[PDB]
Amino acid sequence: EKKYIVGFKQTMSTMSAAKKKDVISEKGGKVQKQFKYVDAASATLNEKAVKELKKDPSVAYVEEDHVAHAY
Amino acid sequence: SVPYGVSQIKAPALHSQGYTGSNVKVAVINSGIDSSHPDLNVAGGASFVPSETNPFQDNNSHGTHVAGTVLAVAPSASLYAVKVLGADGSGQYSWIINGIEWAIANNMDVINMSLGGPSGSAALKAAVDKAVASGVVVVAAAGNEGTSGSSSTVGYPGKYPSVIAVGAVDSSNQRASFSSVGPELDVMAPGVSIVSTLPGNKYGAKSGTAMASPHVAGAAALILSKHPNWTNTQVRSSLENTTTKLGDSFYYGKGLINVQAAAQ
Ligand code: NA
Fold this sequence. Notes:
The complex is a heterodimer. Chain A is an alpha+beta fold. Chain A is built from two helices and five strands, in the order βαββαββ. Chain A has a single domain, classed as Peptidase S8 propeptide/proteinase inhibitor I9 (Alpha-Beta Plaits, 2-Layer Sandwich). A four-stranded antiparallel β-sheet of chain A has the order 2-3-1-4, with helices on one face. Chain B has a single domain, classed as CATH 3.40.50.200. In chain B, 32% of the residues lie in helices and 20% in strands. Chain B is globular. Chain B: This is Subtilisin BPN'.
């Protein structure tokens, strides 16, 4: 539903934590946690933000932030 | 006192040789580790559950239990509570990423993930892949999904090519009925009626692939103590190659882990 992971393009597109954050907020997203090593961030996205963000030149992927459990 | 599964994996003969996991930093990426347990030595940690800030409080029980399996296998190992899961035993894939990421940052030798989900993540792949590229032995529970016809029932992260996906065997080498199957299945370790440490200065049997997983993260720590110069690549190949060979790789992977054979 609302919890997603936004994958970034780096030489296809995006680098800074401040650019990464603006790329989200530009499409009505709300940036959660900007990853250290992984070129991605957790974001709060409506259905509009998922489709707008899927088409952005700076975006590699928009995927749901899935639930894991202890086995 | 010493859990049976320790013996089954041939942990006791490695111990005698003098190898106990000395100088190995092991991340338990779980629900935390209970600080109140007089039998559990925590080297540090971090929490990634937004509402549960202390890695040292386990409101679940799973991470305390897992942690006690690691330290039974590898008693001289350095344990770290990486809290990724809340009270209900669930966390977000991002929270798991943030845990992996601290383990990369903290110069963790071995990651245990006694968890998963049904659905893939590109970000979950990037985080495991990077831990592996960084030289971390990445160990994960295969899942508790049984058999689903022809399909892989292997959860993520264990489903990833970079991770060592661990199914559960009982005391008689028989695959646990709950034990997730598939091509992504790497090794079997004891996962049936596992006595480990539980919250509130307790002991108790748990069953799950989450019980098999720590036996392999403890085995990687024991090899690393005998072969400090071995890469994650060498640690994994030796573990997969020196197994007590069981049936079909789809059900059993390579077989049961033999730490003594694996250690060289
Ligand atoms: Na795997």
